[PDB]
């Protein structure tokens, strides 16, 4: 029925309705994404340098994307995206990922970089991330996490166009 | 009538201030059809953006928009406009001037913008070039990118007074 | 006896203070012909850290190194166990204990300066001359050093856990 | 008679003693480099991200060195650099050089960059500067005040030699 | 070139701080049978003060000691003057720089531990192997050293030692 | 068992309170022919101190001890480990872990009066008949039971104990 | 009658000033050859402390002292029970419960100087005239009239007094 | 008009100040073998005292002295009447006043060094060359002059001084 999005994470006190959230988020991340250890997720998702955008059908977690926001380098890392199996091909991935420029736009962050694998890289694709990397390999060596053998890729975000 | 120059821009600590503001981005978005006015506006009113306000009799007439990058050495140039009934009298060369000189004070001495083919005439009369001293690794993903507008940069002479 | 591993820095503790002494202690004791001053200089300063190597609440080796998150590497300044705990894997351990703590930063190449007394066992932790790093990346960040050689280690990522 | 180098600035929080030293640097560095507009001096000697080191004979403003700080990229910008007409070819020169030298093997930068005429480049050539630019253009374009003409030099540090 | 006489001691700022590491350094190289981690402990003591002679900026020597003012004496902890230095009078200098240093605080006895190759320096700074202090005041306050010589200095307040 | 070893005393909350009250119970259960109210007031008495040797959450021994600073002395004035704990070395590293406390404090010098029951245990702690504290520090101080053998143990502060 | 005992000091309360008065009073009515006034500057030191028997609110003896803690003793200064009250045990329980006080406060040891007429009063009270507390401890510290016998009283810990 | 009052540099309003000047101007004037730079440390020594005889607002005499209350004595540091009114008794009166001060405060030892030209005026006060306080409790306290003679006076706390 009803769809919320919001954008929540563990600031350095939290609702415990927003707590519940991130449990939720944490069990769907864990579960859409079985060889990511639970522990190295839960830290993630728990960390206040991290943000997550949450959805929300009915009060209950249904997917989320996890990010770190680099704006001392110009871009954000995208650590997880995930939709719970039973809700997948119905769109959501799409407007997360709409959302989430969205958000991203209105706070001047105009690249997003993410790990792909070969399992959801062709969702990457459609939502407009390429393997030509613009942002300088200086800029983002020492801050994402590698995740290597997996293919890194960019997506460059116009602040002029609408995306919700 | 009388001609003020002011730099202003939205604080997080004024009313003159704040409709100027709001002409400036009127100008802005009619001289600039292509820039979506809310785009213009989320960019005139953010905090780290910088506005050098042109002003004939309390009215709003010109300005350019930037943005100062201290850390990263340069100014990015936002939007420039002279409202229509007042082009071709100069007033666009001594906004560049007076950006010019109040960027020596702050010891910022260069300049990047992106100029489509419309406006890249008026940036090389400022003393815009093509070729682009400033590297990539400085400017990517902090200036915005404009794909398909040519890149121009302007050096500053401190040693000059400009206005 | 009892081993411990820690890294750290000049802000602290009391117990900090007189390990950091330590260190200061054995890196100029094993590097005689730095001046101690310098050496006291890098061990304090405070975006330097140290990997301590402690055996009974003892400083028996330590390797001092600068990180350049900004740069992807991280320099690696002094390496040093006491003569008595030499040549017993102590080197290996302290170097794996680095390695290990770098890959949950994120920072996956090591930069130092050999010299002829101990190039080898940097060969023995996976460095050699090969520097993939550009040096756009690393000239004026890390202290060249005339008649040293530069060596780099490459580590490989990890997921936690 | 008395000597005396100090590292002084205008910076956050004004002394009397060190305002009047400010005003002497300003006026030496205009009255020996007189291509540089006195405004232009005035500023940078007073702007907070710049020191300069004063060379004081009994109390009085001799000499001195500014300077600009680039930590974050490893090297140190010389501004201006002057000893008052009537104290020259004394090795003040010299003794400043040395002393900003050990001030910076302190502070952990070891690398110094500056614009020199045709007229200077000798003094710089004996403190041990090199027109051998070792730092990448990349590092110091656009923070480092580019005087075309002039000669961009280098000087390298050894933080294991006590120069003062 | 410049030499200057500083009374310092934990309790902190960096320049304090590398000078107790450089009287540390050059006390355990002239003192090698006194542990290093030892002599760092004292040194870094906050009851502990030090004397340091300062030649360019560097550490070129120290006294550290321990002041008692409730038992009415000072424990010399330490001396050492660096290798390249000795012979030329500082460490005549620092002793009596720390004599006058005790004649403004009050405090006009020094007691110490000697070994057979340091009585001499003590010995040419005034101290006697003859104790006026009694057992009772100073046994369990200094550290006792088996093997090594108790040896006394008495101050003069009403003398200019530096 | 998971071993801790902790320095309290009373001045104060409940766990340390029943450690203390274990503590009174062990050393009043090893030292039946003492008070009982007696060692209850020393175990909590503010210038008292007992170091706590913990066991799974429960008190297996300790060493109260009385701190005289102003003397240059500690006092140890009760020992014990429980019955089933004993012959393992317990009250070996409650005596280390008392020593390096002391260290760190410029205490050197433990005095007691140990019982003929004890002084083994006191003599493999390195405890002596030689007493070199003089009698008019301790006199008075602690309390001269007779029959009771006066022991003295010198801690070695350069010599490392835990 | 209601009997109480009470350690009272000054520095306040108009009862315990009332009582010192009272104090004041019997010592210097039992001790006609000391100077009432230097009854009343000890009385009311505030370093001193006295131990009041009250019968019935009205004070009727007591035992006026000056712990020296820093020394490990304590003076006895005045003893007197009213005439009327003596020879009924009064002064054997006040002493009793200034030894009980003690006991509790790690002071183990009483120092009195005795005229002829007291002597005896202290001998049944298990005071001696050999006296184990070094002289460098109390000389100077109470007071030594020419005439009187310095008489030591040792306390236990482990008896129970009162 | 002659006037009494016990003054020091306790951490002084002008008047004070003034006549510590005075004091110290005037023990210099009479004891020329004190370095004038010594008197004035010690007469404004927070630690030291000064008894000061006053005659019509002016200066005339005093004795300088320091309480170790601690150690439960004190030291006559300086004495001296200037030159036109001496053997007038002022010297008796200092001192008298001087002993009536120190009896309401419980101390009853004066110690102090004099040479030849000075034992004849602490012999007259009642000083004698029999010292009775141990040397544990005054040496390093007190400053010792070689070749002067330490002499001791005892109060009595039962005895009005003034
Ligand atoms: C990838 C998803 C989050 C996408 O969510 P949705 O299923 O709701 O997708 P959507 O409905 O919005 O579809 C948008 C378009 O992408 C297409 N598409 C192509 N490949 C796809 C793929 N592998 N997964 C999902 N969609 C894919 C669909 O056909 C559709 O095409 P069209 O519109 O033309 O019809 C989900 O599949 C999921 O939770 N997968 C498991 C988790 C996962 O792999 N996450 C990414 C791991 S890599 C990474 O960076 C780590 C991480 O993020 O977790
Ligand atoms: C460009 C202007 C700001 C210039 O204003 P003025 O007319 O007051 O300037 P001026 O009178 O000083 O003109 C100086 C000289 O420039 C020369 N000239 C040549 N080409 C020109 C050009 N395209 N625009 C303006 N002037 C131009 C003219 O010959 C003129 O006369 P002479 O040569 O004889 O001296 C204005 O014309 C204007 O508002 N234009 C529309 C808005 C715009 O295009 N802005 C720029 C892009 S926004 C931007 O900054 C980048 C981005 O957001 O992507
Ligand atoms: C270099 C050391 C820290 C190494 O410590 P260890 O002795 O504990 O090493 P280890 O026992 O773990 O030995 C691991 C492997 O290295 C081999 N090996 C080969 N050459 C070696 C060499 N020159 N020194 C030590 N080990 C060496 C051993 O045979 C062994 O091989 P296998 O196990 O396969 O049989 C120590 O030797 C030392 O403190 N030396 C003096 C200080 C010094 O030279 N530091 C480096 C300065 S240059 C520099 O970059 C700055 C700095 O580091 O200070
Ligand atoms: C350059 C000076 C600061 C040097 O000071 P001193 O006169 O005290 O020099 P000194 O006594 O220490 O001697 C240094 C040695 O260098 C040699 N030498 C060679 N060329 C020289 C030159 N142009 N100026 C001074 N010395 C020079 C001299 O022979 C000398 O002796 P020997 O040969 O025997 O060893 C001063 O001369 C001066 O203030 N000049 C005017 C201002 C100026 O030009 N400043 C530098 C430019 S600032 C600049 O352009 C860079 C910047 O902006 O920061
Ligand atoms: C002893 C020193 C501190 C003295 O320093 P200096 O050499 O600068 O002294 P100086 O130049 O003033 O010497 C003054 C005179 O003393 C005489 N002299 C006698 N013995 C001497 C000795 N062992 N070392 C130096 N001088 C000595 C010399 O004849 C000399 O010349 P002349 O007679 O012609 O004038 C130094 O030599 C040193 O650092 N030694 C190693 C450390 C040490 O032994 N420290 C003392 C123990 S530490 C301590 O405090 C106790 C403890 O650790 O328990
Ligand atoms: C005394 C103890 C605390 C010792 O504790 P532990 O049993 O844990 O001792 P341990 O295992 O660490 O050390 C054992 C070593 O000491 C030697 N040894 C010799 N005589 C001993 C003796 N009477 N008790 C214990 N050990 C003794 C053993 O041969 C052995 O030798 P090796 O070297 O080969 O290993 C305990 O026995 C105990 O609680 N006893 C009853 C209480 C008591 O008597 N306390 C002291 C009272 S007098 C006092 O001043 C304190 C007090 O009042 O309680
Ligand atoms: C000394 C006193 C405080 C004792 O008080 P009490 O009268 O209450 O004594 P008490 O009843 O408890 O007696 C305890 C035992 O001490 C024995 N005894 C021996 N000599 C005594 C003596 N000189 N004075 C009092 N009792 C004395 C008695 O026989 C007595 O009985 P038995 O032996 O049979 O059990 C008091 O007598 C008094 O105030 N005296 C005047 C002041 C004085 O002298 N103060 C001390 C000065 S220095
Ligand atoms: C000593 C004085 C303070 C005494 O003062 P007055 O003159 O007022 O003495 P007075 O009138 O009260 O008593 C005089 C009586 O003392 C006797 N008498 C014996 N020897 C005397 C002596 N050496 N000095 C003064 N009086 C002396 C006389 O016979 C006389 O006898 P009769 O009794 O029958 O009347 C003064 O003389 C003085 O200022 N002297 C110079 C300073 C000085 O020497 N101060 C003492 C040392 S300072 C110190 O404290 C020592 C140190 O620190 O080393």
Not at 64 to 76: A, K, S, V
Not at 98 to 106: A, D, Q
Not at 139 to 152: P, S
């Amino acid at each position: 029925g009803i769809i919320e999005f919001h954008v929540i994470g563990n600031s350095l006190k939290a609702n415990r309705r927003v707590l519940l959230w991130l449990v939720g988020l944490q069990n769907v991340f864990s579960h859409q994404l079985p060889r990511m250890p639970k522990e190295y997720i839960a830290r993630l998702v728990f960390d206040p340098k991290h943000k997550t955008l949450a959805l929300i059908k009915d009060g209950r977690v249904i997917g989320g994307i996890c990010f770190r926001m680099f704006p001392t380098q110009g871009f954000t890392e995208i650590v997880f995206c995930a939709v719970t199996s039973n809700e997948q091909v119905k769109g959501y991935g799409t407007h997360l990922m709409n959302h989430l420029k969205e958000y991203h736009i209105k706070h001047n962050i105009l690249y997003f970089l993410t790990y792909a694998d070969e399992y959801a890289i062709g969702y990457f694709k459609k939502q407009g991330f390429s393997k030509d990397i613009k942002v300088p390999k200086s800029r983002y060596l020492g801050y994402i996490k590698d995740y290597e053998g997996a293919t890194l890729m960019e997506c460059e975000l116009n602040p002029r166009i609408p995306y919700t």
